[PDB]
Amino acid sequence: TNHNLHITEKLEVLAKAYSVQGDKWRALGYAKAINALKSFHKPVTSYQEACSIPGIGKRMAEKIIEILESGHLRKLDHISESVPVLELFSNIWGAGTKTAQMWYQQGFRSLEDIRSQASLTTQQAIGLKHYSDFLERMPREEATEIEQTVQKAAQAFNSGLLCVACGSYRRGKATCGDVDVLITHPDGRSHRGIFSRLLDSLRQEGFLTDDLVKGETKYLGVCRLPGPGRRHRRLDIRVVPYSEFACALLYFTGSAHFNRSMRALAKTKGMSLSEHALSTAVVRNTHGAKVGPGRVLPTPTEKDVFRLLGLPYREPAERDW
DNA sequence: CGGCAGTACTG
DNA sequence: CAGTAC
DNA sequence: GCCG
Ligand SMILES: Cc1cn([C@H]2C[C@H](O)[C@@H](COP(=O)(O)OP(=O)(O)OP(=O)(O)O)O2)c(=O)[nH]c1=O
Ligand SMILES: [Ca+2]
Ligand code: NA
Ligand code: NA
């Protein structure tokens, strides 16, 4: 639950304004502060109580106080008039802040302008054609149907293939922004040849409607279940070796902020965590950049990753931040 | 002062 | 590479 | 934006 809604509702506006305008680090600080404020027990009442929470500094506490005594945040009144347009433009899949800012500088103000005059990448044209659909979340039951469709298509090639939807779905959420399907095989090797033939099977069946990204082990695209009343949905599919399964599962399950916290912690302990592996004895320079590789640590299960980092295990539902 | 996660596709 | 995305 |  959140007992600081009257504060966070105002902060989210500012954080989004900073995000679409490209000030990503300031936005990150706002996001983190907003999460910290949602994850609390008591409505904040003092500048001193505010600064005590992790993720809240003097500036953010000043803002919270201006909120408690006045009910309003003056800074909301000086957001640039371009921000709603930038948000509109960057909600196109494949367009971000830089593209939105360029479109805005060219004088474009609406999606009709984009459709008729803008130069679009292949991805951005798919994103525009599904603009409304991609802003919607689906019921988890539909995510289940999409996962089962992928699983049944994959297990037709090799019965031994394991398929797991990993994302807000695995974290137990009632709705899902897209479906994240991780595929492996405990053999350790048969996963190698199935990916392209799987995608051919799904697009031959009419399930896949558009491709966004096509790597050797990574796919991002668009699907739609058959029959009436169905929307187009974003679908991400990864195929990983069994030895990397635990770390791929952890990454793909998220949340994103959870992953960043876990990876930041690993960095403090001279380790490095990615979707491939947890590594130890990684040599870095004075800027936190990697100059030497280190060695992979055995992580047969998600619990092993937590254990090697000195943390208590957190269930997927407990990984929202 | 200066990092803020680590990776992968596109063109 | 810069931009964008998971 | 925050924080070491
Ligand atoms: C966006 C993003 C995702 N991820 C990881 C964590 C996510 O659980 C996983 C899938 O990405 P998403 O599908 O974007 O994450 P989600 O499932 O939580 O969002 P939604 O419910 O709206 O569909 O990828 C990152 O590590 N970093 C990122 O920036
Ligand atoms: Ca998802
Ligand atoms: Na604090
Ligand atoms: Na976008």
Residue numbers in the entry: 250 to 570
Q: What does the article say, verbatim?
A:
Biochemical assays, site-directed mutagenesis, and X-ray structures of mutants of human Polλ incorporating sequence determinants from P. tetraurelia PolX or metazoan Polβ are used to investigate the origin of their fidelity. To further probe this mechanism, we engineered and purified five mutants of human DNA polymerase λ, the closest relative of Ptet-PolX, targeting residues that contribute to the induced-fit mechanism of Polβ or that are suspected to contribute to a similar mechanism of Ptet-PolXs. These constructs also included the following mutations to facilitate crystallization and diffraction: Δ1–241, KGET, and C543A. Because we could not crystallize P. tetraurelia PolX itself with various DNA substrates, we set out to crystallize mutants of human Polλ incorporating sequence determinants from P. tetraurelia PolX or metazoan Polβ: these structures indicate that a Loop3-based fidelity mechanism is incompatible with the fidelity determinants of Polβ, which is based on a large conformational change (open-to-close transition).
The Polλxt-R construct contains the I492R mutation that involves the position equivalent to Polβ’s R258 residue, and the Polλxt-R-SD2β mutant has an additional mutation giving it the SD2 motif of Polβ (NEY). These mutants aim to determine whether introducing Polβ’s key induced-fit elements into Polλ enhances its catalytic efficiency and possibly its fidelity, as well as whether structural changes such as thumb domain closure and active-site rearrangement occur, as in Polβ. The Polλxt-R mutant exhibited reduced enzymatic activity compared to Polλxt, with a 2-fold lower kobs and a 19-fold decrease in KM, indicating increased affinity for incoming nucleotides but decreased activity.
